[PDB]
């Protein structure tokens, strides 16, 4: 049994451009747990990238969130690029603050 | 507390 | 009102890398207090929530020994597996295991459960009843056979009725303002304009606890199709988000209902889109 | 010119029948100077340990602890030794020695056909019963060991039996009785109740 990861790229607070904010890529529903997660600003990775503890939910499948401090401007593009054995080639969610 | 769990293994 | 401890656990075999990694973790309805890692510098459970914190030194000792001994015993099952399945050791293979009791208002137990998966897939399972087992396939059945053989279930019912009660309403009193408290979701509807003649609304909900929330969309009385609800996302302090969109037409921006369900929105909600 | 040296010798103290968390000694003796000692065991958790040699009284010896007896320490051991270590020559291995863990499951019930004094020259079958679906059991006379060990069957009252043909009733003895699964050979439940098989004349 193997699933594909659901993938939600969202903000913890309303994103007001120029306001510290925090980054969430929330990773879900998916078997095995080897998860390669990636929280990208302008193409460039970014490191100081935290995640939480390994949990699963009823159905074993396991979920993870990624955060990591940042604050929105008008043109700076932000993504979550996903890799797991499920996926042909790594997934890449951009984000949207209406989102 | 956690279960002090079973020595049997499966 | 049913509030329930949970403690789950995942081991993961690393054939190239030796020792098997393992992730347990515990949960009081939502909210994680603890967490024991294999791959730590000095492995150890650890406080994941400020009310533990206060716990003295027998706790942490005693429990970490728990998990640690927990660790060797999937190591030596995930082995195991490999034979009952025809595997080689090249391969890598999971094995989850979630134990943990519900307590309703009643004070005591409501329902006591030891589920364990291999590889994703069901394998053995504890009974309602917290005397009997039920196996996934024929190779599960085995373990069953010999876990009725050494009366496991009567040491998983001594700590299910017993001290995952005691030990729950111990947490829920110690940190009862962090884990008894409902906080009502912020709600308000977003208008997306897709094309001259389609826009879509977006039912939002944010910075509720518990997780559990209904939000679905309403035309002059229940399209659940059509809605793109979307998964409960944590946002990061101990709250979460969720948000439903529908498309409408140009005109008829109304008429077009939101419902919102919680436990700390007591009475419940109607709204729509307010230009 | 030595060759491959002879094997040594391996025994269990107190023996291979040992209880959940008890500690073994595996020792590995032989009158050749084995500087080096490795003892192995094969299955499904395969491991080598490495102790070096003690000389007393021209023999050779090691004392392995195997440590609190789990399920993964269950299994047959070999042993070898060695003079050398800059690789190590190592010798022909010793005679395995089954190593089982004893206590993991419910004991089983002991009982005797015709019965528990019987008379001389009759034919005695011994019954290992249990409501526990253990697919094999193993029976051993007090001292004269050799476990016999024969597979079981699902009765109508629910039990899982083996029966044990024993032969003309000669001296009797005290008898133990374990049960175990197919695929776990080496793991053993608690010992049966010791069943005591006396014997008298036959009348005349
Ligand atoms: C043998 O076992 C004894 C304990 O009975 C221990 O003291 C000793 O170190 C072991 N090894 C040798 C070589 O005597
Ligand atoms: C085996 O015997 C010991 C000692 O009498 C006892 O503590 C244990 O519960 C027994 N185990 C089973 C499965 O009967």
């Known amino acids: 049994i193997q699933r594909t990861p659901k993938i939600q790229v969202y903000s913890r607070h309303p994103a007001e451009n120029g306001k510290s904010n925090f980054l969430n890529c929330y990773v879900s529903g998916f078997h095995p747990s080897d998860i390669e997660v990636d929280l990208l600003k302008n193409g460039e990775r970014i490191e100081k990238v935290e995640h939480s503890d390994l949990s699963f939910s009823k159905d074993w499948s396991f979920y993870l969130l990624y955060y990591t401090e940042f604050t929105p401007t008008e043109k700076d593009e932000y993504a979550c690029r996903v890799n797991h054995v499920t996926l042909s080639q790594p997934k890449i969610v951009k984000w949207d603050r209406d989102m | ?10 | ?275 | ?204």
């Open chain 4, 1 to 204: 010119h030595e060759g491959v040296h002879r094997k040594p010798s391996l025994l269990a103290h107190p023996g291979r029948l040992v209880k959940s968390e008890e500690t073994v000694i595996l020792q590995c003796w032989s009158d050749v100077r084995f500087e080096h000692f490795l003892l192995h065991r094969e299955g499904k958790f395969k491991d080598t340990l490495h102790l070096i040699g003690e000389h007393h009284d021209g023999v050779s010896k090691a004392n392995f602890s195997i440590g609190p007896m789990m399920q993964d320490l269950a299994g047959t051991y070999r042993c070898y030794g060695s003079v050398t270590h800059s690789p190590y020559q190592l010798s022909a291995p010793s005679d395995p020695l089954d190593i089982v863990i004893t206590g993991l499951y419910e004991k089983p019930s002991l009982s005797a056909q015709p019965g528990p004094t019987v008379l001389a020259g009759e034919s005695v079958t011994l019954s290992c019963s249990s409501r526990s679906s253990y697919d094999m059991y193993h029976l051993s006379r007090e001292g004269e060991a050799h476990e016999c060990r024969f597979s079981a069957g699902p009765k109508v009252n629910g039990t899982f039996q083996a029966d044990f043909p024993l032969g003309p009733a000669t001296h009797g003895g005290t008898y133990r009785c374990f049960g175990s699964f197919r695929d776990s050979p080496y793991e053993w439940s608690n010992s049966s109740d010791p069943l005591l098989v006396s014997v008298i004349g036959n009348p005349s």
């Open chain 2, 1 to 10: 507390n956690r279960f002090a769990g079973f020595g049997i293994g499966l």
């Open chain 3, 1 to 275: 009102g049913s509030h329930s401890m949970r403690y789950f656990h995942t081991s993961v075999s690393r054939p190239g890398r030796g020792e098997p990694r393992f992730i347990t973790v515990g949960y009081v309805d939502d909210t994680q207090f603890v967490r024991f890692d294999s791959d730590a510098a000095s492995p150890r459970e650890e406080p994941r929530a400020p009310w533990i914190e206060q716990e003295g030194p027998e706790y942490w000792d005693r429990n970490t020994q728990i998990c640690k001994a927990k660790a060797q015993t999937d190591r030596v099952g995930l082995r195991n597996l490999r034979g009952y399945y025809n595997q080689s050791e090249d391969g890598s293979h999971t094995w989850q295991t979630m134990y943990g009791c519900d307590m309703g208002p009643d004070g005591r137990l409501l329902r006591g459960y030891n589920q364990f998966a291999y590889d994703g897939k069901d394998y053995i399972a504890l009974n309602e009843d917290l005397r009997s087992w039920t196996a996934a396939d024929t190779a599960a059945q085995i373990t069953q056979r010999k876990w009725e053989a050494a009366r496991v279930a009567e040491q998983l019912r001594a700590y299910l009725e017993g001290e995952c009660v005691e030990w729950l309403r111990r947490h829920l009193e110690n940190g009862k303002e962090t884990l008894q408290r409902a906080d009502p979701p912020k709600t308000h509807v977003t208008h997306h304009p897709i094309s001259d003649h389609e826009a879509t609304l977006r039912c939002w909900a944010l910075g509720f606890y518990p997780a559990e929330i209904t939000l679905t969309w309403q035309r002059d009385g229940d399209q659940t199709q059509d809605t793109e609800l979307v998964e409960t996302r944590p946002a990061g302090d101990g709250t979460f988000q969720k948000w439903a969109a529908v498309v409408v037409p140009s005109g008829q921006e109304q008429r077009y209902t939101c419902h919102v369900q919680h436990e700390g929105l007591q009475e419940p909600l109607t709204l729509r889109w307010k230009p």
